[PDB]
């Protein structure tokens, strides 16, 4: 079924050449990305930062591989990367992200 991927990335170039290196590599059928301010602790102080986030749109049979090439391409260490599921999806775009993929 379809699966949302949540990631965030340290500026908007990096998020969109990200996702359409994953649209290259046909493991995502789209992606919505949008700015956002984040906050975090980070070596003992609290931190406010400027980010992009992107949703990616994908199946649950690519998500081990999402997982692993959005890993291998991301700018952060240890970046956030997890999955939203849906509970349910238009059949029309259910079948265009399917054969997407």
């Given at each position: 079924?379809?699966?949302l991927v949540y990631s965030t990335f340290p500026?908007?170039?990096?998020?969109?050449?990200?996702?359409?290196?994953?649209?290259?590599?046909?493991?995502?059928?789209?992606?919505?990305?949008?700015?956002?301010?984040?906050?975090?602790?980070?070596?003992?102080?609290?931190?406010?930062?400027?980010?992009?986030?992107?949703?990616?749109?994908?199946?649950?049979?690519?998500?081990?591989?999402?997982?692993?090439?959005?890993?291998?391409?991301?700018?952060?260490?240890?970046?956030?990367?997890?999955?939203?599921?849906?509970?349910?999806?238009?059949?029309?775009?259910?079948?265009?992200?399917?054969?997407?993929?």
């Amino acid at each position: 079924s379809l699966i949302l991927v949540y990631s965030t990335f340290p500026n908007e170039e990096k998020a969109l050449e990200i996702g359409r290196k994953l649209l290259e590599k046909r493991l995502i059928a789209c992606f919505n990305a949008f700015e956002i301010r984040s906050g975090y602790w980070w070596k003992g102080e609290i931190v406010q930062d400027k980010e992009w986030a992107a949703i990616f749109k994908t199946t649950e049979e690519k998500e081990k591989e999402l997982y692993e090439e959005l890993r291998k391409l991301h700018p952060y260490e240890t970046p956030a990367i997890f999955t939203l599921k849906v509970e349910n999806v238009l059949t029309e775009y259910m079948n265009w992200l399917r054969e997407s993929v």
